Design a protein around this nucleic acid. Structure first.
Ligand SMILES: [Mg+2]
Ligand SMILES: [Zn+2]
Lengths: 180, 299, 45
RNA sequence: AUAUCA
């Protein structure tokens, strides 16, 4: 082994606590998009940490694109400050990470059909529909996308340890189904 | 049954049907005398009598697995019949009649299989897949013309009748991602060789070409030469290799058209396989015209 | 000419002897040219 | 149900 998964995307939610006028928000923000007809939220962005926020009239906000939990909270506080600077009585509350995505490379090809047959109740593999095997782990409850190349995607985690836990649990199985 | 006199654990007993007796094979004691012919008795339920003259014909067979136990005759015209009373007694059956009408969705499956050229064993699996998942809360509110389009591939995937999901996308309807999620929530409750016969037939190739393409495609997978390309592409590519090797050739445009793949994609798989063309062919393949392994396009 | 649609999609010719042995039907395909026209008028032509 | 047997 020796491989440890790399975090790729962190999704979080934040309650600003006050109602927002989206045209005002979009108008005053330096990096905003807002087309009511397409989606009901201002799509705001900041350069550091590089992230994207979906800002709603209710004052709720979704922050995505961060590569670390630190970066997620940091960028979230920053978006909240922007809203304040524009003039609303916003508050940075209820910061919570909802989804963590990770990925790695085991460095060997995998026999997906064998794995799907062996771990049938957790696996779903339809190569004509999507080339990767969808593995639904029980403990921890994580979803893994397994590819012939040996590249692995882990998602559905609320905490970093779950990403790490799942990979540790899957590695022996990937080894059992290697090609070379 | 077990002989009261002997009692040995494996109770060796014979059914002397011809004398209508059930005997203990060891002591010879007759264990039963009344014995009935099940063949002829079953002839009374499922006969050839559609006219109505047979006095033996006195019942009818039903299917408790598919329609439960719904015994029900139909008011219809007889020899001495006024066309008035038939209408009234039928207009009276209308007030006594929702889910006893959703059985006409079996008529949707039956008319889909017959439009897809599917066997009698596939319909009865598609009708049993649909009866056990159309009232599920796990399917909730899925596209009702895409959950019966998914239960046909569920019935085909047990009856060994090769039908790609894109083959059922042509029938009805199918929204791809919509009948792909529905094909999984029910599942909780093809290969190269599959297409080769049909594609080759449309292609108009000989058995020789079909067999070799079929052998190459399998070897391609066995070799793992095509990492993750769709089987349809692999097959179309293999068909290209074999056919080009033989006299009657078919072009990428023509193969792709039949396989319903694109030449560029067939090109993609083909070139991946070409390097190991030698390993791929059947051993007693006879390249003809002027197409030997060296000469194959290589494209 | 008479044909048969096997379980594995493939259609091919069918001779009387194969029909009698595999209990098939010695039938051929019926094909008809169909045309679907469309017409329209506003509130005769 | 058709065919047939005396
Ligand atoms: Mg006589
Ligand atoms: Zn006995």
């Amino acid at each position: 082994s020796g491989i440890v998964p790399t975090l790729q995307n962190i999704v979080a939610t934040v309650t600003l606590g006050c109602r927002l006028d989206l045209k005002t928000v979009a108008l005053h923000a330096r990096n905003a998009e807002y087309n009511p007809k397409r989606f009901a939220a201002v799509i705001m962005r900041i350069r550091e940490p590089k992230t994207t926020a979906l800002i709603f009239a209710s004052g709720k906000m979704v922050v995505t694109g961060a590569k670390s939990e630190d970066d997620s909270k940091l960028a979230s506080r920053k978006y909240a400050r922007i809203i304040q600077k524009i003039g609303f009585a916003a508050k940075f509350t209820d910061f919570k990470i909802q989804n963590i995505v990770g990925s790695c490379d085991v460095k060997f090809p995998i026999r997906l059909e064998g794995l799907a047959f062996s771990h049938g109740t957790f696996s779903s593999y339809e190569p004509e529909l999507f080339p990767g095997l969808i593995y639904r782990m029980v403990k921890p409850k994580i979803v893994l996308l397994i590819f012939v190349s040996g590249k692995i995607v882990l998602t559905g985690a609320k905490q970093r340890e779950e990403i790490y836990q799942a990979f540790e649990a899957i590695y022996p199985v990937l080894s059992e189904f290697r090609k070379m | 049954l077990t002989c009261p006199e002997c009692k040995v654990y494996p109770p060796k007993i014979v059914e002397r049907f011809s004398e209508g007796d059930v005997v203990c094979a060891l002591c010879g004691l007759v264990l039963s005398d009344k014995l009935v012919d099940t063949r002829s008795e079953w002839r009374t339920f499922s006969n050839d009598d559609h006219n109505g003259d047979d006095p033996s014909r006195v019942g009818e067979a039903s299917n408790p697995l598919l329609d439960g136990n719904n015994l029900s005759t139909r008011i219809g015209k007889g020899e001495t019949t006024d066309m008035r009373f038939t209408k009234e007694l039928n207009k009276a059956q209308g007030k006594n009649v929702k889910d006893n009408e959703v059985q006409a969705a079996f008529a949707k499956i039956t008319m889909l299989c017959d439009a897809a050229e599917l066997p009698k064993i596939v319909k009865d699996c598609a009708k049993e897949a649909y009866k056990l998942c159309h009232d599920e809360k796990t399917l909730k509110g899925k596209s009702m013309e895409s959950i019966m389009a998914a239960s046909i591939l569920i019935g085909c995937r047990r009856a060994e009748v090769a039908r790609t999901f894109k083959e059922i996308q042509s029938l009805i309807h199918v929204k791809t991602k919509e009948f792909g999620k529905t094909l999984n929530i029910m599942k909780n409750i093809a290969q190269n060789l599959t297409y080769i016969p049909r594609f080759c037939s449309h292609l108009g190739l000989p058995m020789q070409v079909t067999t070799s393409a079929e052998y190459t495609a399998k070897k391609c997978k066995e070799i793992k030469e095509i990492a993750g390309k769709s089987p349809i592409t692999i097959a179309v590519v293999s068909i290209y290799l074999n056919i080009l090797l033989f006299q009657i050739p078919i072009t990428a445009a023509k193969v792709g058209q039949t396989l319903q793949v694109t030449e560029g994609t067939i090109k993609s798989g083909y070139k991946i396989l070409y390097e190991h063309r030698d390993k791929l062919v059947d051993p007693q393949l006879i390249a003809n015209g002027v197409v030997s392994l060296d000469n194959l396009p290589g494209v | 000419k008479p044909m048969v649609n096997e379980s594995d999609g493939v259609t091919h010719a069918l001779y009387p002897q194969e029909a009698r042995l595999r209990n098939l039907t010695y039938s051929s395909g019926l094909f008809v040219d169909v045309k679907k026209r469309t017409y329209e008028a506003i509130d005769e032509l």
